[PDB]
Design a binder for this molecule. Structure first.
Ligand code: HEM
Ligand code: NA
Ligand code: NA
Length: 275
């Protein structure tokens, strides 16, 4: 009865209702990125290459250190997933993320769907393909991880801007204060430490805050700091801090690129919902 494209649209409606009710925009963006971020451009075969294939839905991968707390996001999406047999987790994760950015006031991401789902937890990538926030050499570590995905310096800086959304919890990743004046009252579950004052608003404030460092309640990870310390990253970081339009353009394109990493589409070229 309902076409697969129609189901994705219905799922998007459900997601928008979920975001309006739970204020869970940030975790949805993190979920999508952690499914896609395991992509390795050097591996040819699907699903060994990792990436956007819905493997992140399995306990084995959710248990990876970098994925602490993501089971909450999966659980929030499960009820929606159950309504649509024609919607894959691979697509649902990316749909929830893109919708989250947009509902949060971000740019419209040029998205395509039709991603195929892996079927067994044995197809999940091994742990260690996602970045650490506190390595000995942050900037080089970012290159090691993102260059492997086939992403460049521009994309590394632009995508890091997603930290304008959400916060860190010492009970999850281990970073951040237990709470601050900006998070102690929610909305959603209070607590943790945000990078920006309005952590439910998608704008270029992340770049301004990590550079200014005037607010002790605002978080700055070694990898965020690397954006302004690195001779190449700083070019884009300063540009985004001063040009919100430039950030939105580069962000939309980078987010779309990330969302496709390692995926196998059906049909091969995928399909659009509003093209
Ligand atoms: C540059 C490599 C990155 C590192 C080292 C990193 C690290 C972190 C850490 C430590 C947290 C705290 C999580 C917690 O407390 O539960 C976090 C949260 C988050 N990150 Fe990243 N991140 C990176 C890249 C990205 C990218 C590329 C995006 C998406 C375009 C992103 C989106 C988010 C979001 C939305 C949250 C907040 C989730 C929430 O509030 O529950 N991150 N990240
Ligand atoms: Na995956
Ligand atoms: Na923000």
């Amino acid at each position: 009865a309902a076409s697969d494209s129609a189901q994705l649209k219905s799922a998007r409606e459900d997601i928008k209702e979920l975001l309006k009710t739970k204020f869970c925009h940030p975790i949805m963006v993190r979920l999508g990125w952690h499914d896609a971020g395991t992509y390795n451009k050097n591996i040819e075969e699907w699903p060994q290459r990792g990436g956007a294939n819905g493997s992140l839905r399995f306990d084995v991968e959710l248990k990876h250190g970098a994925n602490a707390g993501l089971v909450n996001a999966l659980n929030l999406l499960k009820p929606i997933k159950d309504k649509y047999s024609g919607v894959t987790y691979a697509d649902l994760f990316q749909l929830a993320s893109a919708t989250a950015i947009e509902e949060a006031g971000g740019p419209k991401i040029p998205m395509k769907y039709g991603r195929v789902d892996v079927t067994e937890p044995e197809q999940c990538p091994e742990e260690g393909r996602l970045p650490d926030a506190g390595p000995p050499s942050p900037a080089q570590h970012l290159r090691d991880v993102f260059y492997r995905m086939g992403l460049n310096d521009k994309e590394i800086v632009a995508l890091s801007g997603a930290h304008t959304l959400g916060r860190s919890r010492p009970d999850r990743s281990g970073w951040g204060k237990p709470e601050t004046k900006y998070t102690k009252d929610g909305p959603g579950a209070p607590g943790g430490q945000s990078w920006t004052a309005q952590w439910l608003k998608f704008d270029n404030s992340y770049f301004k805050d990590i550079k200014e460092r005037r607010d002790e309640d605002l978080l700055v990870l070694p990898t965020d700091a690397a954006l302004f310390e690195d001779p190449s990253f700083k070019v884009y970081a300063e540009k985004y801090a001063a040009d919100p339009e430039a950030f939105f353009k580069d962000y939309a394109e980078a987010h779309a690129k990330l969302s496709n990493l390692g995926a196998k589409f059906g049909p091969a070229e995928g399909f659009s919902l509003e093209g």
